[PDB]
Design a protein around this ligand. Structure first.
Ligand SMILES: Nc1ncnc2c1ncn2[C@@H]1O[C@H](COP(=O)(O)OP(=O)(O)O)[C@@H](O)[C@H]1O
Ligand SMILES: Nc1ncnc2c1ncn2[C@@H]1O[C@H](COP(=O)(O)OP(=O)(O)O)[C@@H](O)[C@H]1O
Ligand SMILES: Nc1ncnc2c1ncn2[C@@H]1O[C@H](COP(=O)(O)OP(=O)(O)O)[C@@H](O)[C@H]1O
Ligand SMILES: Nc1ncnc2c1ncn2[C@@H]1O[C@H](COP(=O)(O)OP(=O)(O)O)[C@@H](O)[C@H]1O
Ligand SMILES: Nc1ncnc2c1ncn2[C@@H]1O[C@H](COP(=O)(O)OP(=O)(O)O)[C@@H](O)[C@H]1O
Ligand SMILES: [Ca+2]
Ligand SMILES: [Ca+2]
Ligand SMILES: [Ca+2]
Ligand SMILES: [Ca+2]
Ligand SMILES: [Ca+2]
Lengths: 366, 366, 366, 366, 366
């Protein structure tokens, strides 16, 4: 059976092809003690690093979809195979995912490690947004995938990709977490360490939502306290936040909040559709597929619907497809693809990798 | 029963002899994907290529009545027989049409394919303008046939053709479509791809008309906006065009608009009549038969009547016969001819083709 | 009842003996298509060939009174009997006409066809000028007969012919038509085909006249435009001719216009009278009978009167008898002769033709 | 010194009387730009129009020997006098040529322009075929002259013309060029513009020849490729033609190829001889003089010899005189005539033109 | 003296007629601060915006030769007149340039601003490719002009334009810059902002070149590192690029690299020549004039020579004229045209603009 591993930037989602859900879901973190021991492992990975984060410095080996710490990335892959899935990687073909427009050396180094360190029989690196379309049972649609590191738009029509219309934005969940940490200082809450960043991320996932109209929401938050909610910190301290709940996700629609010049995800989606041929835009307007953890904010589909409707012609039918399980769409789509009989010719086996070299990994790479 | 196939340049009109209308009418196009697939046929034909034209490069295998891509032409014939008509071509004699003054090798290669690839029992290649006269129930008249590729005049008197008076002009619907694409840039509309050319062709068939007096119409279009009409593009964008509605068909009467030196269709019709014997001109003046899709513009018969009246002597009765179904006149006339008991000796059977060789196809070829 | 057929050269005049006018009058032409058919008889005869002459090559089987195309001559005789008169030639004796001084084989071959192809019971070949004298109710006079092919003078006195004084001139209507075609090129009108020759012949019969004094008429035509008349061609073009109206018939009086050395019809008439005995010249001078279509020009009798008066002695009374129906005088005279009880012994029956052979047809043949 | 100008239809041949060759030989064309200028004369004449024909519409002011555009004809005469010959026309008597049986107004208008626009001291309009006999040093012969516009036969015996035997045919070089353009479409070559007609004319003059036996030549051309020759177009494209080489000149012997009813030049020559007196036919048979550019095809004299021999009695000696310089025979003969001391009384001076008016130009006009 | 302003899309080139080089050359950009000030102009233009681009959002008011932001376009014109040239526009006639086949309203709005905002005495809008031919001292040639926004081919012969052969392609320098930004992500370099786009444009102008054979160059770049070059970013970071140097300009010859269906500039040039009359193609083949900044790549003339030679017949002489100063050819040609005494009648004065209205600006507009 095939292994499907979706290591985006924040989470590792790994399982077996054919299943409906990933077997192992844990943070893609490596923690090392920042104090000296007196009574003791060298490093902690995943959920283990998350439970001991008080005495650890947490590091993400993937930043903006690009693996920057390869020794830590091997630790995470090692724990995924042997501790979480408890398999021998030399017996299972492995389907990996990647964001589009990544550096070529990222996929090449990832292939060299899977074949020479873990000795997988075959492997394949798919594009994350394409797998999200498999999960929704569609052949046409523009996929907006947004995780912890990268947000990207990929339009697909009748099974054909339009690579020239692919848009990538280095604004995602991790940038929203850092922005929430910044604006939480307005209320006197100081989160600075890598362990406290994990607390702010949990605050973001519990309390943050997308306002349908940002300016009307800011007036409501300034008028009363009906939007304020409380959150209990791990030490028992209770914090209360008001407009920070919707100001943090608003960065997705106004990237200037964090000093970025790019347009929001609604205009990026619209600009990607407008780069496509005029005859396919109507189908793309009706098949906006949202994918990834950063699309899980309450009210984001209604806001995207409202924003794209204002940009598109009035006669087009704008339809945002936001399935409830869209946080696992990339993994579910990879589970479907790795189980197709037509896909079994697309595997890059260990034999044809020793012949063609690293150049073989860049097929269907846009 | 006999098959009647009228593949002019833009459309394939195929059916069975004896019927009143062609069974299959679809564009004579072959589309191939101009992007790479990621989720997938090699080529698309006819209406199938028209519905997926957003991701295709569309090619017409016939240009100016001459088959230039023979592999694509066989794809279209194959889909016509097996997918549209759903017959076995080895059981039906096939009547094909052709423009006059075509290259000899075009009809010879078309005959070799029908006998060796499709194994038809017999076949015949008629001239398109002669069939249009059959459709109108006449034996005398000058036929002005104009499709997507070629416009030609053929005078016939009492069942006798006058080949020396036959005139052919490589200005037809496709050249008008390209000219409309050019003058649509005056209003900021940019249609460049082969898929957008199909959109402009649909604009031409909906909104374009022939002005009775071109200079008075240009003054009216410059005075107000009573001539402007709107058209909704497939993506919801609404375009508005004014004098482009009648400037595009005016190229038929002023070929210098597209840089051609030839005279318009009115002078070509008059010059063809004046090459005929003086004793038959009166009957030709009263039997101007218009045929083909490019004669379907509103107001073209009144304009032709006005232009030829100004050229002919004042005592002649100019009568333009423009039947409402003249877009199918060639097919309808071919359906009548293929059902005549007198025509059953004119078939070129497979046996007499293996004996006389390709030379036998050039009988009654003018 | 007897059939009277007067086939001179240009027209077939056929009817029944006893009538006052020929039943069938049509051109002695056979037309064959000079183009190929595409939608169709092999040949057309008479008025049928005249109405379709635009696509035909017209041929006269009789040239200068001599039948040159015998297969076409049989077609004309066949259509005369079965289509125009609608009779069985095997039930009616047939009176035929002929110009004097014709080749002997012309009458012999004409007799063989009437007896072996049409199986007439009896036949007779009369001289055309003698029949014209029957029509005028005279026994004395010099007949000037002129049709399309031949002009001849035959003097008759008290019922006796003077064969040594018979004069024949191969200048008639067809030569005048060809001369009018030639001089019409002076005004830029080009008639060349056999169909256009029929148009010029119609122009000749409508507009041409004989000038009383040719040189005074040429000065009047060069002084103003009072002699110019217009004629509308079949295609609506209007032509205007001036002195060509009287220059064409002037060839009858000046045969040098067409390069002939002979004298005009006035001198030929005078020379024929002067070859007769001196005692009969006075009666011949007073009985100049004009006959045939070429004597139908306005002013020809006054011109003949003036010209012969200048040649004859001043004491002679010159009288030109030009009856209004002189175009049918030969047929009318043949109708009178074939109805005489004294003539019923002159028939050459089928029985006495099988005995004496072709030699019997040359009785009373001068 | 006298000027000799031979402007037939296609070429202007002008020079001085007494020379052996015309000084200026250039096409009788006027070209006007059919596009608009952006960086520029109004019109171009002769060789200048021929070198810029890519952006010009070329017009021949003479059609079928008849001047149809008088303003353009004056441009050509103006450039002939001032640019090509570089003379003052008011100092030189001008000998002009003309085809027989031309409209009277053509010579009258040509005389009015030479006397009132160019103020020539004297002028004379000769017949082209008569000058060709001067060039060959003969007094007896039938001249077959054929240029670009008109073909005509003029028999002359002992210095006397026989005008009644003069035959004129509006089939010449320009009609052969148009027929070659038509049959070149059989091989897929499309020449339509007036500039491309000049290319086809150059093809005709290089590759076309007269087949001795047309049917045997058609079998040879269909059997192999020994008759095929190549021609490089101005843009570098190479075309190959086979039987079109001899099918184009065959129209001279079979005018039905272009839909004309007339007989070929061999039968027209024979019919012209048979209209002459029987005593001069033997000398005409032995003195068939060919003249003009359209008689320059290789093998035309041998074909004419063969065709007329088959028509003439077997005891006659048929001799075709085709001198190598017969393309300039009309000009050379005009140079000889204008240098004769006996001809100096035949000039029509400016004084006697103001007295007699336009009527004086029609002397010795047949 | 006249002002010559060549504002294509990327650069403003302005000066005085009669000079050899433009006085002011600066980017056609308007920059506005994307952060808030704390210590400050509203907008920056040209070189001023380029030096402060770190804190600005840069906008080009011209996109694909079409002015889309008219308020910013007036800022650029204002700074050109008053800050760069330091003149009063009400004292100098202004020659402006434009790409062919532009929207009509672009030139009309540009004329209204020059006459009502700047009050120029007269103005004229020339076509850019026509001016390039003036700069090279030619009257015949096909000009390939390519700037930042648009690439167009204009064939001219003997001073006459062939508008029907004019081809326009919305692929130029800005599209190559965006494609280089895309393929630079393959090496891990992320340029996204409008300020970083200016850095990539500088990289393109320094290191990019046209490969003579693209596939052989891709093999050389994959074999070693002899093609790799380094570039120091403004912050001191050094980037190294290999095959991106020639893959970026290759888009000009393979527009499918950026998802465009059109053919490359070599086939577009060839197709434009093949739409011209056959008699002018030889001169166009020998006079391919390259113009604009996008033709400044090393090796582009040798590649164009090689590509067109493979398309043209082997006997044609292909000559690419790429002068070293061709980046200013449009301005230099406009300086020559505005100094011609023949051009002084072509100015559109303020008086005749108030009379004829905006319709007067479309003269010589193709
Ligand atoms: N309910 C939620 N609301 C808002 N953000 C969420 C939610 N759940 C997860 N996220 C964010 O999604 C990001 C991870 O996205 P995901 O696509 O699941 O993994 P990866 O980033 O590894 O591809 C994290 O930054 C996390 O904060
Ligand atoms: N209503 C219409 N008005 C104007 N043009 C039309 C109309 N309908 C069809 N056409 C044109 O006629 C052309 C096709 O003509 P037709 O004779 O039907 O087929 P073909 O060209 O294959 O012979 C096309 O170019 C199309 O744009
Ligand atoms: N009104 C007329 N004026 C002059 N010529 C006429 C007239 N009517 C007939 N003709 C000529 O007479 C000729 C025929 O003469 P006719 O004697 O009737 O017949 P045929 O020649 O057969 O004997 C024709 O050439 C015709 O052109
Ligand atoms: N070598 C040749 N072979 C065939 N045709 C020729 C040749 N040279 C000239 N011609 C034709 O002769 C015609 C011109 O004939 P010419 O008598 O010289 O001039 P014009 O027609 O003006 O009297 C042209 O149509 C030309 O095509
Ligand atoms: N040396 C060079 N190599 C490649 N491209 C260049 C070079 N110099 C300028 N360019 C490009 O040319 C474009 C501008 O072209 P130009 O014709 O000078 O101005 P405009 O586009 O305003 O007409 C810019 O996109 C620039 O990147
Ligand atoms: Ca993800
Ligand atoms: Ca058609
Ligand atoms: Ca008669
Ligand atoms: Ca000549
Ligand atoms: Ca430029």
């Amino acid at each position: 059976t095939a292994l499907v591993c979706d290591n985006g930037s924040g989470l590792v989602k790994a399982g077996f092809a054919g299943d409906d859900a990933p077997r192992a879901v844990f943070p893609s973190i490596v923690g090392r003690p920042r104090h000296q021991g007196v009574m003791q492992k060298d490093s902690y990975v995943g959920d283990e690093a998350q439970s001991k984060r008080g005495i650890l410095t947490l590091k993400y080996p993937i930043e903006h979809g690009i693996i920057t710490n390869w020794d830590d990335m091997e630790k995470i892959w090692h724990h995924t195979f042997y501790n979480e899935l408890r398999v021998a990687p030399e017996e299972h073909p492995t389907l990996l995912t990647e964001a589009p427009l990544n550096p070529k050396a990222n996929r090449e180094k990832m292939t060299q490690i899977m074949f020479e360190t873990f000795n997988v029989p075959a492997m394949y690196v798919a594009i994350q947004a394409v797998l999200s379309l498999y999960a929704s049972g569609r052949t046409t649609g523009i996929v907006l995938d947004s995780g912890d590191g990268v947000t990207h738009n990929v339009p697909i029509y009748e099974g054909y990709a339009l690579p020239h219309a692919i848009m990538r934005l280095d604004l995602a969940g991790r940038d929203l977490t850092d922005y929430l940490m910044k604006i939480l200082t307005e209320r006197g809450y100081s989160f600075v360490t890598t362990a406290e960043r994990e607390i702010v991320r949990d605050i973001k996932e519990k309390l943050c939502y997308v306002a349908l109209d940002f300016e009307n929401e800011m007036a409501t938050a300034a008028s009363s306290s009906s939007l304020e909610k409380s959150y209990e910190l791990p030490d028992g301290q209770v914090i209360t936040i008001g407009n920070e709940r919707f100001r943090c996700p608003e960065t997705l629609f106004q990237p200037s909040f964090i000093g970025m010049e790019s347009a929001g995800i609604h205009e990026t989606t619209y600009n990607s559709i407008m780069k496509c041929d005029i005859d396919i835009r109507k189908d793309l307007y009706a098949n906006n597929v949202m994918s990834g953890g950063t699309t899980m904010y309450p009210g984001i589909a209604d806001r995207m619907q409202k924003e794209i409707t204002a940009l598109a012609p009035s006669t087009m039918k704008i339809k945002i497809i936001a399935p409830p399980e869209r946080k696992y769409s990339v993994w579910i789509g990879g589970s479907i693809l790795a189980s197709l009989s037509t896909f079994q010719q697309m595997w890059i086996t260990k034999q044809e990798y020793d012949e063609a070299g690293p150049s073989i990994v860049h097929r269907k790479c846009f």
